[PDB]
Design a protein around this ligand. Structure first.
Ligand SMILES: N[C@@H](CCC(=O)N[C@@H](CS)C(=O)NCC(=O)O)C(=O)O
Ligand SMILES: N[C@@H](CCC(=O)N[C@@H](CS)C(=O)NCC(=O)O)C(=O)O
Ligand SMILES: O=C(O)C(=O)/C=C\c1ccccc1O
Ligand SMILES: O=C(O)C(=O)/C=C\c1ccccc1O
Lengths: 203, 203
């Protein structure tokens, strides 16, 4: 069973969705196909050019509370980093190879940025993450600045826009798309339905 | 037990929240304090001046699907009206007297506009609603155009902005505020907690 997951490391609601998705991966062996994309580009593409929720103090004050409520439900910390400059770490995702290492990268980076509040553009973050994953620090840093890396990020962001993705976190199962950590319960219902039909419990 | 409910009849997510809230009122006797307010004014007040979700085709296409999914969960129809011109019906709410008649007005109008897809500025809607509620059609129509009616609507919208309301549907219980039909599960948790403490099941 395959779910396509679209996220940007600047997004705290993506941090929450990733935590929940990863527990489904580990608990039930669901296969996640990860896609790091540029939320700014995706918004611009659909004409969503007003002020961002981050720039609207009254609404942001409420979202911080919403985010703590979910973090408490999930039993994880949530700490805002100093900025939302996620480009480097987004691009870095494309260094990862197979599923296990792709998932490990996404988990380590999200935990660093939104679990601990580490700035996503911290100059030493690539080395810190490399040490964690058993990667070659210099190879990784060289990849992050390479033309090929940016091309790959641009390609995936474009493929997302073609798929009618307008925000993050976004999840697809078959032809159904859900946007929001707060729609994973619908994803889970769909997954249960397919598990039942495949077990011959339902037609 | 009192929940303050803030809505604008142009909002389909408010239609959904109202249906769910009303069933709590009827099933468990929860007291709802209704507040019809001007979403446009509340957005302008917090500086939320970009294009609205209604004007972003790609995102609207998804929201229509999200809205059908919830309508199916709740076992109710959801049909888009031809426009979002909710001012008259919003103001009309202030004709209602006590809780039962306030709730009946909000239910009838939401069912008309978002259950059946009736334009909220339909010239005959005030008469249709009056017939339903046993009101004096001419008295109601005269109220809708009165200076006092607009004053009362403006007063409530202003009180909402003071309370840090930035959108609809918004619900308060005590000092906690939740925004969205998709946060009523948190409201319900809070309500259960208070029912338990008041029953001496929890300290
Ligand atoms: N209700 C959501 C909200 C998710 C959300 O606000 N995502 C932002 C990025 S953190 C987004 O995609 N903004 C694009 C938009 O609002 O169209 C959830 O709980 O996850
Ligand atoms: N995720 C929500 C969304 C509610 C929503 O989008 N409300 C609109 C009006 S229908 C709103 O308050 N927009 C103001 C904003 O996005 O800040 C829910 O399921 O109810
Ligand atoms: O870049 C954006 O559009 C944005 O608001 C991302 C940040 C964000 C979103 C939602 C809640 C909190 C938050 O910092
Ligand atoms: O006035 C607005 O800001 C608005 O988008 C209200 C309409 C709406 C909101 C969300 C989903 C569908 C929809 O028509």
């Amino acid at each position: 069973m395959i779910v396509d997951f679209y996220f940007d490391f600047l997004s705290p609601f993506s941090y929450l969705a990733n935590q929940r998705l990863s527990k489904l991966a580990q608990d039930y062996g669901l296969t996640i196909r990860y896609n790091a994309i540029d939320l700014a580009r995706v918004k611009i593409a659909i004409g969503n050019v007003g002020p961002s929720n981050r720039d609207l103090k009254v609404k942001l004050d409420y979202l911080k509370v919403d985010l703590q409520r979910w973090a408490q439900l999930y039993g994880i910390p949530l700490v805002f980093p100093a900025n939302y400059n996620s480009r480097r770490m987004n691009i870095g995702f494309y260094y990862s190879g197979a599923e296990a290492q792709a998932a490990a990268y996404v988990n380590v980076v999200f935990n660093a940025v939104w679990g601990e509040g580490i700035a996503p553009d911290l100059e030493s973050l690539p080395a810190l993450v490399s040490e964690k994953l058993g990667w070659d620090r210099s190879a990784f840093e060289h990849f992050l600045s390479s033309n090929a890396a940016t091309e790959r990020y641009d390609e995936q962001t474009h493929a997302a826009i073609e798929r009618k993705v307008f925000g993050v976190p976004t999840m697809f199962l078959g032809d159904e798309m859900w946007w929001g950590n707060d729609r994973l319960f619908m994803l889970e219902s769909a997954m249960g339905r397919l598990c039942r039909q495949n077990a011959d419990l339902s037609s």
